[model samples]
Target chain A: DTAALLERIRSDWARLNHPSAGPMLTLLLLERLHAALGREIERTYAASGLNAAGWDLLLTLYRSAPPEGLRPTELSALAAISGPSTSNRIVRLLEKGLIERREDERDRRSASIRLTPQGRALVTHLLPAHLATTQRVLAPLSAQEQRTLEELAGRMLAGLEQGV
Target chain B: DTAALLERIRSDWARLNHPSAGPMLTLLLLERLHAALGREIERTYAASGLNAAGWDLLLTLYRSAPPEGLRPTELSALAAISGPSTSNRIVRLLEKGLIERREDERDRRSASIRLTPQGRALVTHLLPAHLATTQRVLAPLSAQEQRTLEELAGRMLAGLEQGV
Candidate 1:
């Protein structure tokens, strides 16, 4: 599997005397892990007829200020997906009756998205399993190990977010 | 930016009383980091009309057994991509004059893929910059810190791969 792939990559890089081989493998490994966890999570969401972004959108409204949900633009940014992708998900959920559109009182052309009662119920129904999936994926790591990994990643991200 | 997003998610999860919130956030953060690093790597590949998978295939051939390259199936498995994806990449590289195909003497219907001289040169030209980009992305961490992160992730993946 990936372990064999890793060994071969390591040997290849060493043969070439690539100085940054360790970090390159590190980045690759992170991609592999993230993909694995993402798949596990999507499996949880899939049975609920939701993908990750749909869940993201619903959760955004779930935590929103009640019937006042989120502007489509705001939702796009928060979901970190393209406008078209966000549009498709919006349409998907709208068709599924999980979310509804509310006309802006200030601007007739503007609309916000809010979860229907069904959408809210769906999230509440799925939350426990979602949490459990993350726990299961990360179960092998001790609590302390997880914390260490978290802090290290936080520091790396702190450095990253600074575009300075 | 993402820091604010993380803050809101943390507060939201705590409010929802999700016990595995930290692990969930950690997984999300890994996804974010991988995406960012992937973009950086792809930028380098993009300049050469390549994406990550393209680069992966090229690198595979760059380290191949010279005149004896890889079977199409072997290449697909090593690149860790689907058949159609591998087909597209192979054709793209073939059209770009970066790679070639050889008919298997024992099986006329079977063909293997190989790098042209041009392909080998292209990877050599690109390798330095690819390594540099990874270094720049990870530079914030001290070398020691990088190793620590690598080992921790390795341990986690080791446990994961067992399927035990």
Candidate 2:
């Protein structure tokens, strides 16, 4: 499906007489690839009723958040989404009994957020399948091919960061 | 900076004892790669007062829309955005005199939308610089390396579409 879309863009750009289409098309392919992979992996966690934003929060807490948890401000910065969206996701996760807050005496509204026992269990259970899904989806590419893909992506990302 | 972040995740996952981290990390790399490349390219059109959604709509019209134009519903499907966002982008473009609409008697609200001559000029002028920007950002990778990245992406994407 996306292959057809890629081919169309190639021919379209050629007919329009672009001096170069390779870099642009390559980026487009990577974009679609990222989105598709994200969607597939998201579906794996959906059965547990956890969406991407909530999953992101739980993962951040699991991976690096302190034992005492993190402030909402810190979580906002750590997670990719906007402050409001993260705020809403925190509430939803609380309702799902997957996360809890440590009320800040100095500031009630700005409490520290952390994973609940349920949240930790959910992540510990979900991640194996999540990682497995990623592996299955990428089964088409050889291990070396996947490594080359990662190397190219890193090089390009590092390239963009230059002169910034 | 991101390289450091990636290394941290690798160590984090290893300490957590995941059976496999390669596929998930590979996907993470691509996600960051796409987002960063998008930001870099978006800067090129930011001077033109065009954001990513607006650019997506314009490119769809340029690349594939009929001479008679597309309905807003069609634009929503063609452009990868929410219907409300697409509607707002269209309104903004019309105010900028970059796009126009043809009234439909049967459905006044669902009129056809297309680029004006001014829009065509804007895209034509912007694209050469846009292409050059892409080429520059991708200069870290050789042509062959880039091709390999594209193939790896395409193969993985095609694999996902199977049995869907």
Candidate 3:
């Protein structure tokens, strides 16, 4: 099905005297898949009264052994957003009582961000349903296909991870 | 490998009594891959005085047959951006003499957006190098692995496409 679309783009470029569409096809596919996943996650988060960035920050905090918390710099590094955005979201989350900040014992000028009891409860309640939705998004693939995707996507991600 | 990362997250969550890390891993992998590709593309585009979003818009226009052009709504749809953002980018491209607007014959009030000769020339010059950058980004996988990635990504994209 998608191959048909790819073929059309390839031939359409051929009609314009261009080379193969392999590069554009790859980029387009990746972007489209990412966009789709984002929309699904955003929809799920919205229902739970959170945005994607906030949910991502929550997950980062949730997974990093919470109560101990994370630095805003670390959260910014882990999140897919910019640094200022992480700070902005932190402010919003604090306002919503979803997360809290404590003065870092070692660095009085800095703060460690932690999820409140409410934030912990929210992520705890939301993750399973979120996982189910993700599983559904990948439902079109078989178990083998899923593994294949994970492997390839993993390889690509590894190339990026080294710099970080 | 990425599988190791995934497995670690799974065990970490398990230690915390959480069920799975399926959703977060999926989202993280997608984001990281896109970010890497974006960084590479932005680096390449920087030399040409373009960013990824602008280059993407140019590519979209380049692929479509010209003269007739496309509507801002259509450009927004194709570019995965909001209408106002698309309009803003269009303005930027117009200032650069990379694109133009012509009154739609069918709708007197609406204009069709098309690439200018300068825009076409720029994209034409930039595409091969861009494709090479893409090829390098995908260099981690073998041909078979690449095909596997494509197939799985295609299926996932199809799920989104039908609804769109």
lDDT of 2: 0.74
Name model 3 segments beyond 4 Å from true: A1-4, A16-19, A76-87, A104-109, A162-164, B1-7, B16-20, B73-87, B104-109
Pairs with steric clashes in candidate 3: none
Question: Comparing 2 and 3 by lDDT, which wins?
Answer: 2
Q: What lDDT score belongs to each candidate, Candidate 1 first?
A: 0.73, 0.74, 0.71
**Per-model TM-score on C-alpha atoms:** 0.85, 0.80, 0.85
* Model 2 agreement with the true structure over A89-136: per-residue lDDT tens digits: 888888998888887566456679898898899888887787778789
Please provide, for model 2 over B1-164, each residue's C-alpha lDDT reduced to its tens digit, 9 standing for 90 to 100.
Answer: 34666766667677787355677677766656666676777877898888777887787778657888888776654443332335579888889888898886675667898989998888878877777777887888988787887688778878886655
| Chain B, per-candidate TM-score | 0.81, 0.78, 0.80
| CA displacement after TM-score superposition, residue B76 of candidate 3 (Å) | 4.8
Which candidate has the top score in DockQ? Answer: 3
Docking class of 2: acceptable
Model 3 lDDT per residue over B42-90, tens place: 7667988885668888877887645688886666555533323245687
lDDT minimum window of 10 residues, candidate 2 chain A: A76-85
lDDT of 1 by residue, A77-110 (tens): 4553332335578889999999998874665668
Residue B95 Cα positional deviation in candidate 2, in Å, after optimal superposition: 6.1
